[PDB]
Amino acid sequence: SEISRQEFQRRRQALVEQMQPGSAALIFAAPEVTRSADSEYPYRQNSDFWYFTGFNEPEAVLVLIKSDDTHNHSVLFNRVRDLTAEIWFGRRLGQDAAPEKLGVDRALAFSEINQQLYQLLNGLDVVYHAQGEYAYADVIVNSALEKLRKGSRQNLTAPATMIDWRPVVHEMRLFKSPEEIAVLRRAGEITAMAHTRAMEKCRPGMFEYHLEGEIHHEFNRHGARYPSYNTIVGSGENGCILHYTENECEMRDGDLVLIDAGCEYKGYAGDITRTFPVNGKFTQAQREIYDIVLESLETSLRLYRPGTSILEVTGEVVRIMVSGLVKLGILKGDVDELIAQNAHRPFFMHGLSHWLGLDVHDVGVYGQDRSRILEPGMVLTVEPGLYIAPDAEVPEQYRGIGIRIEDDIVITETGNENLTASVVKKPEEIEALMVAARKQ
Amino acid sequence: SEISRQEFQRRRQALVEQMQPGSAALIFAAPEVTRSADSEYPYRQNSDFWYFTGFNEPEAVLVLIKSDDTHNHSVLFNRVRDLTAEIWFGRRLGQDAAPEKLGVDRALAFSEINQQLYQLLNGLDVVYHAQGEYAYADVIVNSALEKLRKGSRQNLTAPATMIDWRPVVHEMRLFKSPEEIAVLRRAGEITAMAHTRAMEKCRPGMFEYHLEGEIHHEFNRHGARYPSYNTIVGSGENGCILHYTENECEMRDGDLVLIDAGCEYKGYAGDITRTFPVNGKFTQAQREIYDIVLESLETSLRLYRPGTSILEVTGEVVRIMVSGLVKLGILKGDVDELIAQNAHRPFFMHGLSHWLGLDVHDVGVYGQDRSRILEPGMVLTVEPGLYIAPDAEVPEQYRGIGIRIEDDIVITETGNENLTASVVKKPEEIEALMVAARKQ
Amino acid sequence: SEISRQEFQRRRQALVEQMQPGSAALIFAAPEVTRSADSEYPYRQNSDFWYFTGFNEPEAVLVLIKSDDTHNHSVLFNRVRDLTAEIWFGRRLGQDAAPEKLGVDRALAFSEINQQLYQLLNGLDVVYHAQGEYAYADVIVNSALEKLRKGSRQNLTAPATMIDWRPVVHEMRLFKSPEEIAVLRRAGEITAMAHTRAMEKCRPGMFEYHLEGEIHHEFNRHGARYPSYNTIVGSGENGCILHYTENECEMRDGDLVLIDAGCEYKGYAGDITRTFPVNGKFTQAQREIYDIVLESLETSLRLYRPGTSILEVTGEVVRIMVSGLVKLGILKGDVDELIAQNAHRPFFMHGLSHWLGLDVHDVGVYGQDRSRILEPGMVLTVEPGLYIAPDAEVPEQYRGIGIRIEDDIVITETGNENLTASVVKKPEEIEALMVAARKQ
Amino acid sequence: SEISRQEFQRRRQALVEQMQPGSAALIFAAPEVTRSADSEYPYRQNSDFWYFTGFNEPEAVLVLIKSDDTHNHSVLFNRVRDLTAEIWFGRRLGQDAAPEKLGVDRALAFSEINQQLYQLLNGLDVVYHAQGEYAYADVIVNSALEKLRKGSRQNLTAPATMIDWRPVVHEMRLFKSPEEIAVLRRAGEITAMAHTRAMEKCRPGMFEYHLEGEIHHEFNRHGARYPSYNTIVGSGENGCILHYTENECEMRDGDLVLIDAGCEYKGYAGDITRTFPVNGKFTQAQREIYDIVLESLETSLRLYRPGTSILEVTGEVVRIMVSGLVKLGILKGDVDELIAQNAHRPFFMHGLSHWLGLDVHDVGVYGQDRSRILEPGMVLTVEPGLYIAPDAEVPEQYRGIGIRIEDDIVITETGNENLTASVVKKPEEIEALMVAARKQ
Ligand SMILES: CC(C)C[C@H](N)C(=O)O
Ligand SMILES: CC(C)C[C@H](N)C(=O)O
Ligand SMILES: CC(C)C[C@H](N)C(=O)O
Ligand SMILES: CC(C)C[C@H](N)C(=O)O
Ligand SMILES: [Mg+2]
Ligand SMILES: [Mg+2]
Ligand SMILES: [Mg+2]
Ligand SMILES: [Mg+2]
Ligand SMILES: [Mn+2]
Ligand SMILES: [Mn+2]
Ligand SMILES: [Mn+2]
Ligand SMILES: [Mn+2]
Ligand SMILES: [Mn+2]
Ligand SMILES: [Mn+2]
Ligand SMILES: [Mn+2]
Ligand SMILES: [Mn+2]
Ligand SMILES: [Zn+2]
Ligand SMILES: [Zn+2]
Ligand SMILES: [Zn+2]
Ligand SMILES: [Zn+2]
């Protein structure tokens, strides 16, 4: 799946709809990022710029100008074509091909932006700019506005009003279109196939990073070159570290391994966590913790629908967690009192859910304590976990156990669709899968 | 292989040896680098900081203080231990364990650097600082020196002399120790195994990125998680782009594919290029260009030794290239005149060799036109290539052909050692390998 | 005369009237300014901050918060009291006395502004800030807004809208109240007494700076310690330089001297120019140029009234100038054609009038080519001049003559009031004054 | 008196003498400084730039290049000539006239400094730069050094060593030449004539600022347009504030007035303090404090010579002060014990002496607690004072009395020369002077 030309057009128009007449919105591309010396990390476009363009070059600026309710036009600034630069570092779109390729009305050289931008902002009332996002963008915008302020004898005027467009754009990004949902659905399948593969390949004596290698290879072969975040493979006590990315340890028979990994497919994030036995068989103690996390997930999956919230579903999970932990002797006391004291927090210290999209921890207003009412089109994770520290004052058998199980869902009219259920999570299904792989 | 504790100690002492008495050298860690929103790229330590420490954390500063010819000591600034931060993002060394772990005399909290650094620089004559390397480092250093300048009533004095240590340190990095050569030898083997694998896996109808996926998986399984640079897989006309990294095209029967890829193993770069037929059989036209590049490489490999230079060996390659091209009718005229006119440049527009080490394009003075005399311990690439543009005014059969063949070598007492010869480059050996893989 | 407490209150309320509900306006004091090393120039408060406060300290910020149409309050940030700092450098208002002294509701320590400002802006929709005015102010404001943006888990929100209040405030400053007009009236008298004195003291063999000394002494004795701008005393050819401030030359019998000087009284600028003979007697050639400039001024003074403009009155002056210059043989041709060609520009190359107030070249929109229609309450200068370069291709007797005559006026309901007519400008009155002084 | 062309030449050569071979010293002019809006404070040249040039323009850079022990040359960057800019704002030196006028070998346009400076620094080993002095200078220098670092393929190299020249230059400035001493001698006379005049003009009912007006007029008429610092006229309790510059109060019969004021003559500072009765007659209580301060000054004047120090002479003053204060009942106890407890500090809380020159508080190393041994050519102030707070717990008659008496001296071979003794300080001579003036 992919995002159509028409969809990028619709998004631009949906932003323009919300803009004041006599205004311009300025959306800047991400800068190139150094890895070491003259070498750079693989380019990752700014998510908001990407959202309006699907264009993967640096040194580009989308300018949307609204004259009134029925009159608007777009200007792109982008890199000029340069045979020497293109022989060395790769092909560029240029100005001639840009209007047709990206559906903009006009394309200018980025090298001329300081000569041109003030002319576009001259006489407008409002400029929409995400101030503080990038230093290079702020220099450009401020420089343009100073030219206009100081240029009254050349009959120039600056817009006196500057508005951060991020609240508006992130509110748009919070609600996925059918096209976006289709892309995220594929990202979920890709990510699930990778997690299945990691389970099937895992053996004692392999390193954590070996499973990372399997996962990234699987992402790549479906056309997701990059992960959406740094892959986490925490075996044993490493599972109690939420974003453990060292992935350096030999995986030991008897330990669990926690894998949090997600592909980036057409800009969109998958985000799955599966925890399983390194040797393919859960111990009793491991099952006892696993079952609590699985019940939390399965119950959350049932409950999530329009009209509830992350906060409200979290309350049900806290109850399941505190109850399970009291039965195992990990907590002691009255369940309701323990809940009132948030006695689960030493063992579950993060949120159940986050928004998901062009960023793995996606943009959009959560409301106080993530109390915002859910509506169709919102996409989020469901990731309960229990992390018992190596030195927790609890029965010995639970110490050093970290388990998270995470699915990705989209809120529908009547409930939710699970995008990541094609990778198993019931312990008997995990064991069967691993057994079948070891034979083969 | 790896770098020993003792080696890191030797390097620090070799820097201190060259420093003036009453001086301090300040070496800063790389900052963390954003990929998108709150997500960050996998951390890559600054090569110079790494060279003296093997320490892979941000927010760290190595301070080497030389009192005189026989008196010096070291201070590390590094992140304090923080249970919440460590539960979330991973374990930290801290101050208690640092002296023993990294062989420094003293370790302080990085959060106290502004309270502490001026005290360390107070009364010294010279400070060694790589000004302009990092903005955060410059703020810290300048702030310390201002405190000292303005603090004469508190009996403070600033060192009046600031010296860039990079020339000195990069000159050290230019000459590899036996330990470094052993590590680079392993990086070369790992990288070669990956290139062999790409050749064996290649089929028509696969995408360029599929071969990238194979290569990265191979790097990872030998314990090189990351490439040293963004992998290049240019099939067909994409081969004429030197750092083509889009890797997005379906590979076509009849085309060549050029793969430039290198692992990062213990900080050190492999860097191999192999070009081969997608369908496993070179055409006549492809062989005719390939043979010229292979002769250039084989001849360069024979010639490289102490006492020659990149410039001098390049002159021999230019002759081979111009001669081969005249015989094919790609160039026309007298060979010596064509050489004098640099008539090869449209087809070979980069350098034959670059330094290799902790950076793929490694530090160290080349001399004018890379004329510096080679000595034992220098490590460099040997990468002739010919790139015939799709629209070159040459016989049709050569258009759109890009071929590079690149090996990594270390200059020895009597010649060089080739680190990357375990992956084949003779066309008959390439074909045999691919045939054997297709059977299977 | 002075500005009352009530007037400062009215101005604040007039700004708040124009502000959106759920907004805050931030007005910053001027920074202290270095003259050399640890010594500083006499403090000059920012004109806009002064306009709302009459408060002459640095490190102060006026915050006006509008909740709705009937609810607003003010917060001052200012320097805390400090006995050591006050023994050394002078008394401070502090927080306790500020509410009563400056009629603000609340006063906080400026040293706590970063801990406090974000709390004041939290949850507002709009912030009024003159971005780019001062770097220290921008750091403070941006820092506050970043705290709010990043603090959603602490239930913080930033105002998305930032508005430059300068257009609004400068439009207010453009129209003087009766109190302001009374103060400017006194500034005009003070400045006129100083110019009279300079005429009476002038003798051949005195230096240009001696007349500056007389002028500044006169300003000071009426309680205007500082000039509103750097005093200009251009004798001879120095008169052809518009802002000649070297004032270094011996004044010569036979030359004219041009004095442009103005006091600063309660923040408000006087601005007078008088040109007169060093020896107290105009030559024929000097009179011939002087009379043209005087007619231009006298005619402009008659014409200026509500409904005309600087542009329109300038057109009448250009006609007077071109006509006078043609009669002297300084210009040649048809008067109307010469006017159409702007043939006066080599000799009159600046504007006839500028706004006058808290700045000598005062704030306020002029309109294209200063075409804005004049209304009662606007205060402006009237300063025609003719400057014949030493090397002009004109009759010898006019070369090196610079003459400007400048008055300050306030537009009234029926015309204008001249604030600076208490110093003579008719040549016979100038001569009589100088004669009487020499006896002284 | 003035500084000769030859002297500026000698100073440049004295700096070059101390520089390493293969080096360049960069000395930048002061930036122009805003007073309000588009108006600027009278230009004050940077003291170090002035010291080497006597050149009073902004946007100028002196570059001194030392090839070896017998080969050096100079390059000036300065503003280009511009008829429009010169008609408006004043004449400029330009490039053609600069070599002859300022004795430099070469003059280039300041607008070309970024195109030219890196070429001058290319291939040098050392650059002398006062980093942090001016932000505009740092941008220029850093930009040049980055061009050189990154330009190795254009055969460019940056000097690796940067040295702050300020310690060296300020050590030069600490020792005045005969020419400088002659200029400072005239500054002292001018300043003394101004203080005499203030005493003669003072009457009850005049304001503090009126005496400022007299002082500045006197400075100006001898050709010292500007004061070296903001003039202090503290009558009554205002005398207990060390740098009281409000000068806003009506001077009252019965009070003392403390005047600290100094001219700037050819860049050099006068610095005199005299305290005297507003009504021309010291009271008993006023005499009792005055006599202690006068004895401190007279004794210090006798003691100051080569081989002593500010610290050592201060110890004698502390003894005089503590003894006088015990006799008046302002202090209580054993004199030696009171001295050991620094019991004088509430009443004398500043230093006895500071260096004097191109800055009023002049450059140069003082040593710990101003213990540096004095040598011929050092110029310094001698300014004991006693400041009894309005609320001091001392006999009523001493409360609110601030007295300082300050002279300027130059250390000679056998003692010192007093530059400011032409204004009276003995109380009977003060009274006689004021009596004679009142008749006026
Ligand atoms: C950053 C957040 C939106 C998500 C994170 N996993 C948390 O629960 O805290
Ligand atoms: C950057 C250089 C050292 C290497 C690069 N391949 C070139 O030949 O230009
Ligand atoms: C800056 C302007 C408002 C005034 C100036 N005298 C001019 O006529 O150009
Ligand atoms: C700044 C110092 C050199 C001088 C000042 N009067 C003091 O005694 O503290
Ligand atoms: Mg266990
Ligand atoms: Mg072909
Ligand atoms: Mg004449
Ligand atoms: Mg008294
Ligand atoms: Mn996850
Ligand atoms: Mn997640
Ligand atoms: Mn390569
Ligand atoms: Mn290479
Ligand atoms: Mn004027
Ligand atoms: Mn004017
Ligand atoms: Mn003084
Ligand atoms: Mn002094
Ligand atoms: Zn996460
Ligand atoms: Zn390369
Ligand atoms: Zn002006
Ligand atoms: Zn002082």
PDB file of N, CA, C and O in Angstrom, chain D residues 276-292:
ATOM      1  N   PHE D 276      33.168  68.616  49.385  1.00  0.00           N
ATOM      2  CA  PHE D 276      33.181  69.955  49.987  1.00  0.00           C
ATOM      3  C   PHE D 276      31.798  70.374  50.495  1.00  0.00           C
ATOM      4  O   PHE D 276      30.786  69.817  50.079  1.00  0.00           O
ATOM      5  N   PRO D 277      31.753  71.356  51.405  1.00  0.00           N
ATOM      6  CA  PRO D 277      30.461  71.846  51.862  1.00  0.00           C
ATOM      7  C   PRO D 277      29.673  72.618  50.780  1.00  0.00           C
ATOM      8  O   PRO D 277      30.219  73.488  50.104  1.00  0.00           O
ATOM      9  N   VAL D 278      28.392  72.289  50.648  1.00  0.00           N
ATOM     10  CA  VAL D 278      27.498  72.976  49.736  1.00  0.00           C
ATOM     11  C   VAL D 278      27.470  74.482  50.034  1.00  0.00           C
ATOM     12  O   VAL D 278      27.459  75.289  49.116  1.00  0.00           O
ATOM     13  N   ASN D 279      27.470  74.845  51.315  1.00  0.00           N
ATOM     14  CA  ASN D 279      27.456  76.253  51.732  1.00  0.00           C
ATOM     15  C   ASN D 279      28.846  76.869  51.955  1.00  0.00           C
ATOM     16  O   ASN D 279      28.957  77.995  52.456  1.00  0.00           O
ATOM     17  N   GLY D 280      29.896  76.132  51.598  1.00  0.00           N
ATOM     18  CA  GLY D 280      31.253  76.659  51.638  1.00  0.00           C
ATOM     19  C   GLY D 280      31.958  76.658  52.982  1.00  0.00           C
ATOM     20  O   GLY D 280      33.079  77.156  53.077  1.00  0.00           O
ATOM     21  N   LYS D 281      31.323  76.098  54.014  1.00  0.00           N
ATOM     22  CA  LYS D 281      31.913  76.039  55.356  1.00  0.00           C
ATOM     23  C   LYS D 281      31.690  74.652  55.962  1.00  0.00           C
ATOM     24  O   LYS D 281      30.550  74.230  56.160  1.00  0.00           O
ATOM     25  N   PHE D 282      32.787  73.937  56.220  1.00  0.00           N
ATOM     26  CA  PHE D 282      32.735  72.629  56.880  1.00  0.00           C
ATOM     27  C   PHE D 282      32.246  72.793  58.315  1.00  0.00           C
ATOM     28  O   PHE D 282      32.678  73.709  59.017  1.00  0.00           O
ATOM     29  N   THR D 283      31.368  71.893  58.753  1.00  0.00           N
ATOM     30  CA  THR D 283      31.004  71.801  60.162  1.00  0.00           C
ATOM     31  C   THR D 283      32.112  71.039  60.892  1.00  0.00           C
ATOM     32  O   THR D 283      32.981  70.408  60.267  1.00  0.00           O
ATOM     33  N   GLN D 284      32.085  71.107  62.216  1.00  0.00           N
ATOM     34  CA  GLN D 284      33.022  70.352  63.043  1.00  0.00           C
ATOM     35  C   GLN D 284      32.975  68.855  62.716  1.00  0.00           C
ATOM     36  O   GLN D 284      34.018  68.227  62.494  1.00  0.00           O
ATOM     37  N   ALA D 285      31.764  68.295  62.692  1.00  0.00           N
ATOM     38  CA  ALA D 285      31.561  66.868  62.418  1.00  0.00           C
ATOM     39  C   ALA D 285      32.083  66.487  61.036  1.00  0.00           C
ATOM     40  O   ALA D 285      32.754  65.472  60.881  1.00  0.00           O
ATOM     41  N   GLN D 286      31.784  67.319  60.044  1.00  0.00           N
ATOM     42  CA  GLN D 286      32.299  67.143  58.687  1.00  0.00           C
ATOM     43  C   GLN D 286      33.837  67.201  58.616  1.00  0.00           C
ATOM     44  O   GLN D 286      34.455  66.364  57.961  1.00  0.00           O
ATOM     45  N   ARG D 287      34.446  68.174  59.300  1.00  0.00           N
ATOM     46  CA  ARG D 287      35.920  68.262  59.405  1.00  0.00           C
ATOM     47  C   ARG D 287      36.573  67.037  60.024  1.00  0.00           C
ATOM     48  O   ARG D 287      37.631  66.592  59.583  1.00  0.00           O
ATOM     49  N   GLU D 288      35.946  66.520  61.070  1.00  0.00           N
ATOM     50  CA  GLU D 288      36.453  65.363  61.784  1.00  0.00           C
ATOM     51  C   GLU D 288      36.563  64.131  60.887  1.00  0.00           C
ATOM     52  O   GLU D 288      37.538  63.381  60.983  1.00  0.00           O
ATOM     53  N   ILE D 289      35.583  63.935  60.007  1.00  0.00           N
ATOM     54  CA  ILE D 289      35.664  62.853  59.016  1.00  0.00           C
ATOM     55  C   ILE D 289      36.600  63.240  57.860  1.00  0.00           C
ATOM     56  O   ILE D 289      37.421  62.438  57.431  1.00  0.00           O
ATOM     57  N   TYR D 290      36.473  64.469  57.369  1.00  0.00           N
ATOM     58  CA  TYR D 290      37.291  64.938  56.262  1.00  0.00           C
ATOM     59  C   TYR D 290      38.783  64.802  56.538  1.00  0.00           C
ATOM     60  O   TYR D 290      39.544  64.378  55.668  1.00  0.00           O
ATOM     61  N   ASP D 291      39.194  65.192  57.742  1.00  0.00           N
ATOM     62  CA  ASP D 291      40.600  65.175  58.124  1.00  0.00           C
ATOM     63  C   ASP D 291      41.213  63.785  58.096  1.00  0.00           C
ATOM     64  O   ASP D 291      42.392  63.634  57.743  1.00  0.00           O
ATOM     65  N   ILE D 292      40.424  62.778  58.464  1.00  0.00           N
ATOM     66  CA  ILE D 292      40.879  61.391  58.417  1.00  0.00           C
ATOM     67  C   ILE D 292      41.133  60.949  56.965  1.00  0.00           C
ATOM     68  O   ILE D 292      42.151  60.322  56.670  1.00  0.00           O
TER      69      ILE D 292
END
